Design a protein around this ligand. Sequence first.
Ligand SMILES: [Cu+2]
Length: 99
Amino acid sequence: IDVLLGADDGSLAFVPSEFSISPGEKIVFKNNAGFPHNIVFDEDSIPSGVDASKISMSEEDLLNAKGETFEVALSNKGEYSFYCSPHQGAGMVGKVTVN
Ligand SMILES: [Cu+2]
């Protein structure tokens, strides 16, 4: 599944921001508008034995170019909340469910 980082109208959002995938299904987060961006999984809001470092960027890591991506496949089932560090306050957050 492809996820835009920033909407085509320049809104600071993940598009789509809520979605469900199966184990091992790729997520490709792609810089679209209002970059830089990143994608950080909330380490208190993912399946409790999952290592957030295996699946996310750090808060300092950034995707700088339009069309630059971050790809991840999630294995463990359950809810994963994530956000874009610089833009979290503006609402640039999401949640993916692995079912
Ligand atoms: Cu952002």
